[PDB]
């Protein structure tokens, strides 16, 4: 949260910001309450994730690349 580096930085390099929250959750409580949509995007989240890894273990057709 508090990046300093103290003396030889001369630049931001605040990687923690893109690595903790500061965009995800802030632009999440931005609006829309839903109360239920989280659940459907919860299941759709891994529905896409599990089908990607299912074909990751099944990409060996040939494709001739």
């Amino acid at each position: 949260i508090k990046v300093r580096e103290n003396e030889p930085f001369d630049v931001a390099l605040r990687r923690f910001k893109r690595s903790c929250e500061k965009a995800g959750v802030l632009a999440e409580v931005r609006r829309r309450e839903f109360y239920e949509k989280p659940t459907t995007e919860r299941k759709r989240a891994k529905a896409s994730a599990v089908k990607r890894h299912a074909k990751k273990l099944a990409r060996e057709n040939a494709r001739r690349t």
């Binding site: 949260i1 508090k2 923690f16 903790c20």
Partner: protein, 65 residues
Amino acid sequence: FCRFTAEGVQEIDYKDIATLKNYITESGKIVPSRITGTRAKYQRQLARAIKRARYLSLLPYTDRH
């Protein structure tokens, strides 16, 4: 990738802030099991301890005091 008391049987303690700080990020947030490789069972005991330690102010609710 790394394990814990699952093999070396023992219980998590809210008082032991030596090891409890190793399971939370410096910004006062609990780290998910997908990264620490912690067993789901102990993560729950871990989380209960972190929340108890925060009440006893042995841990930060957030680094921004």
